[PDB]
Amino acid sequence: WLVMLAAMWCNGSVFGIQNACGVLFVSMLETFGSKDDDKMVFKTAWVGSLSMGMIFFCCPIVSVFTDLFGCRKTAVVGAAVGFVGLMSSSFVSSIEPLYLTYGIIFACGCSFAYQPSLVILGHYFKKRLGLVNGIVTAGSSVFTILLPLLLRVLIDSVGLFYTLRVLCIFMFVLFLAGIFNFAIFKVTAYAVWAVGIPLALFGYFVPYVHLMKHVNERFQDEKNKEVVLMCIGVTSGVGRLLFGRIADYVPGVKKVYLQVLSFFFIGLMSMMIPLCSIFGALIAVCLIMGLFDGCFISIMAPIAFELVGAQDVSQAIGFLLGFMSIPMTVGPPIAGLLRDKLGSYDVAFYLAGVPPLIGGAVLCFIPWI
């Protein structure tokens, strides 16, 4: 009757695996090496990009499915289909079949499982949900911290296919645990916000999938390479807690000024990613980037709440997560193409840090009306 552990496991599994796709990326490059094509980064990044894009895209679909097929049934069938897709992802001997079995089937299963966790909390003990949300966000963040060490030890101990075999247990734990009208876009503020946010999300997912390859090709002498994910996760959680507790200090629609500040710092800090000369500098870059990422994710909701009204928060956020699918599945493949054409990720990260600046330039007009 206490869904705290299930919600913590649900959000941790659906996002911790995706946020730790960088080690999966370099593992796929290692296990699929072939000199017949030099654009292997472009093809391989597409798997994780499509996984994230299909997870974010199916949010209105799973919303309308759960709204009329029950939370329990939809959650359990989504966990089952994600588990069977992830299990089938280990029975693959190439890269092109991994598009469907991981970036489509596993992604749609994860999207079908994650969303009902959000709805099931609305009707159980509808009094102290602030602390409930804080605790579940902290648990998801600590799971996202603890996951990449497990991923790396699984990889270098047993391989990649067996690693995907093992992560089905988390999907098995989630298996055990538990009208999209377009009329909201006629308000100008939500329209400009929901066209500027995906434009600012182009370079967001580039480091989450390509950074591990960057530190592998530049810091092979580094003894512990996953400290980046540790720092990014701990600062993400610190940002979530800090901007769930304090960020309501500023009133009105002006919360996006905190959002544009986060986008400006993450853009400039991604610009500073190739400028690093020592590993500690890159680590600090990751701390500030993760803190502002946690800020962004934590304050993702209140601007929507104050813009589209209280009655359309879930539906508007469903559309906005739907529109965020394109930058996730378009950005990092462009970075891979740039790396393949150039030979390094410095220009790739340089260009990936740019569309946060355009997003910062375009969300500044939100407080106008």
Side-chain angles (χ1 to χ4, degrees):
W1 59 89
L2 181 64
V3 295
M4 214 68 97
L5 276 297
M8 181 264 258
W9 206 269
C10 184
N11 198 5
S13 294
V14 72
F15 278 177
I17 296 172
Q18 296 294 90
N19 289 358
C21 277
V23 59
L24 280 175
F25 178 80
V26 67
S27 70
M28 287 184 265
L29 268 70
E30 202 272 309
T31 199
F32 294 136
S34 62
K35 203 49 70 173
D36 51 351
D37 51 351
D38 50 358
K39 297 176 180 178
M40 189 175 290
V41 183
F42 176 48
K43 293 179 175 66
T44 315
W46 258 113
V47 174
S49 297
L50 189 60
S51 71
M52 185 42 102
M54 288 302 112
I55 281 184
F56 268 35
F57 160 70
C58 293
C59 288
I61 307 301
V62 59
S63 176
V64 66
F65 272 13
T66 59
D67 209 6
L68 54 88
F69 286 163
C71 178
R72 164 82 146 164
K73 274 154 91 144
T74 50
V76 74
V77 301
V81 65
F83 161 74
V84 75
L86 193 66
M87 207 58 167
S88 65
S89 300
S90 64
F91 199 63
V92 182
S93 66
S94 177
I95 313 168
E96 299 284 324
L98 292 174
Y99 280 65
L100 61 86
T101 182
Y102 183 80
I104 294 175
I105 308 171
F106 172 62
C108 67
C110 276
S111 182
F112 269 39
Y114 159 69
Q115 205 276 330
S117 68
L118 301 176
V119 185
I120 204 174
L121 286 151
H123 50 89
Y124 285 165
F125 282 99
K126 193 52 212 70
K127 272 79 65 179
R128 47 180 185 177
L129 279 71
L131 59 88
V132 167
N133 264 28
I135 284 164
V136 70
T137 44
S140 53
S141 196
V142 72
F143 197 79
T144 318
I145 292 159
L146 291 174
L147 187 60
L149 265 74
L150 185 62
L151 273 180
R152 190 58 166 96
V153 300
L154 279 164
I155 287 296
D156 65 0
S157 178
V158 76
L160 174 64
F161 298 146
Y162 268 69
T163 295
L164 276 297
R165 291 279 183 74
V166 169
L167 271 70
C168 299
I169 299 312
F170 292 173
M171 280 293 106
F172 173 66
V173 173
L174 187 50
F175 191 29
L176 295 182
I179 312 156
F180 60 99
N181 47 359
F182 292 158
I184 51 164
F185 273 39
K186 302 300 180 291
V187 297
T188 53
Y190 182 48
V192 66
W193 184 51
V195 67
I197 283 292
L199 199 40
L201 266 289
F202 267 63
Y204 168 85
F205 209 68
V206 170
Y208 282 166
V209 63
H210 285 101
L211 189 153
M212 298 290 316
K213 182 64 180 175
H214 177 212
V215 301
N216 196 2
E217 78 180 8
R218 291 282 324 278
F219 300 99
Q220 71 269 17
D221 48 354
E222 173 50 53
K223 57 182 184 293
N224 279 325
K225 268 166 207 277
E226 276 80 18
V227 184
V228 167
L229 274 299
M230 297 322 110
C231 296
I232 205 75
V234 67
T235 55
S236 172
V238 160
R240 305 279 188 78
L241 266 71
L242 185 68
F243 288 92
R245 256 60 179 175
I246 295 91
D248 48 351
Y249 207 89
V250 63
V253 191
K254 292 183 175 181
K255 321 286 296 313
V256 75
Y257 281 161
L258 268 71
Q259 189 60 264
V260 68
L261 187 143
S262 57
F263 276 113
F264 179 68
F265 287 101
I266 189 178
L268 66 91
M269 187 63 72
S270 297
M271 296 296 205
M272 303 296 286
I273 283 182
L275 275 296
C276 74
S277 300
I278 63 183
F279 187 68
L282 192 150
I283 286 302
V285 166
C286 295
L287 276 72
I288 294 90
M289 165 157 174
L291 192 147
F292 285 113
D293 181 65
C295 174
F296 159 59
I297 302 295
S298 177
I299 75 178
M300 253 304 299
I303 294 90
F305 173 80
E306 70 198 5
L307 277 186
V308 305
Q311 71 270 16
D312 291 328
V313 185
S314 68
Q315 180 255 354
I317 209 63
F319 288 169
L320 183 54
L321 274 295
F323 275 177
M324 275 184 258
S325 62
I326 300 168
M328 300 313 212
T329 197
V330 164
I334 292 300
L337 191 140
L338 290 165
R339 188 251 184 270
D340 287 331
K341 201 261 176 184
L342 271 298
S344 180
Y345 287 89
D346 52 356
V347 185
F349 274 123
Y350 279 1
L351 292 183
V354 190
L357 276 296
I358 295 90
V362 69
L363 282 71
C364 285
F365 296 112
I366 297 173
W368 182 257
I369 195 64

